[PDB]
Amino acid sequence: MDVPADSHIKYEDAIDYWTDVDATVDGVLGGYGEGTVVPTMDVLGSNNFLRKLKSRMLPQENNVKYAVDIGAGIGRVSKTMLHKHAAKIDLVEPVKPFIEQMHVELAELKDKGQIGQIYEVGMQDWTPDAGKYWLIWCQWCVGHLPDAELVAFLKRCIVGLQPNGTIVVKENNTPTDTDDFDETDSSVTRSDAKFRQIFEEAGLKLIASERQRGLPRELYPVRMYALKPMPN
């Protein structure tokens, strides 16, 4: 058998790649920007997913809906989707020109004080404050961590959840039970089976798994996973 796909990940190669990508919707969506159906479909599907999960996301212990946008790029998901649902938003993104553009993209939200902290770091080195988040939203980025590191990240995320907080992963899937390494951006595309293994090892239970509909046929499937900590 081949060495594991995730053994080829090199963080420095990923950051070198993304640092030279245009700080635009086309850049962060790998060419599938506003001239395509993808941004529109993405927001529709994410909004529908969160709407159907409302009964699973009632805040507890006097909390409000503080979210974090992980691997946020230029802030597209916060600008176009998360701000409707969340009381306040933090963002985690390692790439410097993306952070710089994020300040422009999120200007209107900043005027309302809706942006808390922007953490210029890779998710592997980031820790959420304990108990802070109603929602930890991880979209189109977790392939940059190998499996073990992703388990570790998700374990830190659990401690970062409010009571009844939720983790969402919105990510590509391979069509078979074999993961694919992409040398261009130094990341892996995982199977659904691999994601389920990782979620179990992190101590999470799936409460929803939904396919993002309406995307161009040539793309890998995209899935939305909603996750809760396993009860003690």
Binding site: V28, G30, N172, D180, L215, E218, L219, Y220, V222
Partner: peptide
């Protein structure tokens, strides 16, 4: 990001 399936 979204990506073309191999």
């Amino acid at each position: 990001p979204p990506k073309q399936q191999l």
